[PDB]
Design a binder for this molecule. Structure first.
Ligand code: GPP
Ligand code: MG
Ligand code: MG
Ligand code: MG
Ligand code: MG
Ligand code: MG
Lengths: 335, 317
């Protein structure tokens, strides 16, 4: 929606002023404004806007004042602040060149390993936003605790992902569906799906831990498909982002399923060519994925997962609106 | 710190590891949980825990003697370990910039907020304590960045080396988390929330923090192995050297400060000797001590002066 997107984007400049406008150190506050302006407001803002929409479908229609919708928007920007911090750090860790076409922050002149500090700074900053706007509301402490908990869980996700690599070479014996599912849950699903919905619920004064647990069950399932679809399109999606999962030696759903279905000779091709810099090595792995019928396998998974998740949504108890979870399903599966 | 204080503090650490690495919960990710136990065990509990133990001492000297139960002194010890978790994340980040992964510093920092939630979420001091940690984290990061703005393309920017910028770096990068945080935590646990009491403490603790770092800066070059010169750090010695330098002495700093060759380090030290930085530190040490002793004696708003004298005596020796 034009009105929702514009109202949301209009909040960002206020959050920069809140965090940067410490009058004795103007040179660092000016630099932090640039850190925020480069890394936080560019691209889709899907997680941020999903927080606003989640709130709009959870709150009683009589309580949906512009004031409250703005508070939802500020929570959305706190999600985008958390993500910005995570992606600054991940880019340094993965030594990536670009993110969404933009050169990675750490590559910019006179940053490098100072990106570590900028990561921590950006993550810490969202708690200052929460204090200014929410310190007087009952949802304050639950929201602070949710952000700190999700940060901790995301770090477990990132560390689990790193235990699939040694000396910058993939450990293919680690590429199991159980480890993949755990990586997606902790590294992606909590901050991408649980965080926006739980923020919406808290702002709507929904504190029942069972309601949050029932939301989690369905959101972790949708989250798994989301990342599996993302992994699939990296290799088989119409380029005209250019996919580099194979070169980077990522524990992707494609690599996991490839190893499940491979005969010994096919396993040897993964051992020899997976996570190598040569473009020839990327094409050999892609050719193996085609040979193992991974496009057909994804097509079956997409149809089956959709049906299973839709069934689980129909069985949701409590005051949780099924509407919200069907709406999330629609945007992800695009149907 | 007394034997009993030290031993009962150290005894808390294994509990905090079990609390954070999910002992009792039966986790779906044991491999990475076991790794985090090792990150904590290897990086957090080793050497002197002076910030952690200072939090316990601060609480013991602010709380009414009747309220000093083993249970409350243990809580003070847990706040102390949260300061040591912050210290550990900051040290990891310094090790990285010069087994451990890059996100371990973010993880360790995040873990202190899990410890705070577990032990303090139902106490009145909860919101003030988490807000103090949030604010100190932010300020420490600002200090870290201000320090980095004294360096461009691997070279020190000597025009940035002013006493104004140095004082700001020490205040934001070190003094807030090293001196303000332990005392304010003690005060909050003792249900002392009055902003004027906190501001009275801050004034003295920012002054102690400045001597602490200036003494550290001095001993790096003139102690009995320091690499501040080689690393081109914005140290008190370099700041004062540039204040006192004639144009020829400035050119020696321009040419030889922040160079890897050990000969450049000895040239800078020779220049520091020539500029009378030892004598200058001796004057600063005497004058700062007399000013800080004065302010501690003048401390009001119902604060005990003996807490701050103990901190002062530990730093100045
Ligand atoms: C604790 C931290 C730092 C978490 C990082 C979370 C994250 C979404 C990383 C990107 O994943 P990726 O590296 O597998 O993919 P890409 O970089 O291509 O988006
Ligand atoms: Mg990564
Ligand atoms: Mg990456
Ligand atoms: Mg990428
Ligand atoms: Mg991807
Ligand atoms: Mg030093």
């Amino acid at each position: 929606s034009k009105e929702e997107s514009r109202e949301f984007m209009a909040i960002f400049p206020d959050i920069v002023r809140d965090l940067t406008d410490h009058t004795d150190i103007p040179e660092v506050t000016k630099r932090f404004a640039k850190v925020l302006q480069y890394n936080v407001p560019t691209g889709k803002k899907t997680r941020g806007l999903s927080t606003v929409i989640a709130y709009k479908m959870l709150e009683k229609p009589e309580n949906l004042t512009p004031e409250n919708v703005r508070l939802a928007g500020i929570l959305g920007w706190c999600v985008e602040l958390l993500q910005a911090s995570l992606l600054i750090m991940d880019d340094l860790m993965d030594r990536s060149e670009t993110r969404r076409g933009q050169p990675c922050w750490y590559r910019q002149e006179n940053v490098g390993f100072l990106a570590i500090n900028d990561c921590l700074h950006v993550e810490s900053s969202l708690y200052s936003v929460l204090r200014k706007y929410f310190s007087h509301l009952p949802c304050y402490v639950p929201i602070i605790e949710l952000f700190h908990d999700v940060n901790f869980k995301t770090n477990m996700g990132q560390s689990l992902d790193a235990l699939c690599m040694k000396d910058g070479r993939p450990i293919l014996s680690q590429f199991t569906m159980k480890r993949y599912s755990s990586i997606v849950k902790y590294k992606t699903s909590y901050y991408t799906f649980q965080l926006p919905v739980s923020l919406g619920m808290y702002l709507a004064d929904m504190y029942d831990p069972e309601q949050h647990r029932q939301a989690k069950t369905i959101l972790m399932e949708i989250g798994e498909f989301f990342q599996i679809q993302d992994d699939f399109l990296d290799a088989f999606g119409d380029s005209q982002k250019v996919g580099t999962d194979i070169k980077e030696g990522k524990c992707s759903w494609l690599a996991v399923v490839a190893l499940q279905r491979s005969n010994p000779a096919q396993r040897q091709i993964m051992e020899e060519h997976y996570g190598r810099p040569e473009p020839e090595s990327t094409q050999i792995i892609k050719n193996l994925y085609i040979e193992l019928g991974l496009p057909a396998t994804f097509a079956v998974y997409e149809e089956e997962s959709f049906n299973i998740i839709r069934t689980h949504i129909h069985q949701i108890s409590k005051g949780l609106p099924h509407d919200l979870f069907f709406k999330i399903m629609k945007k992800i599966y695009k149907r």
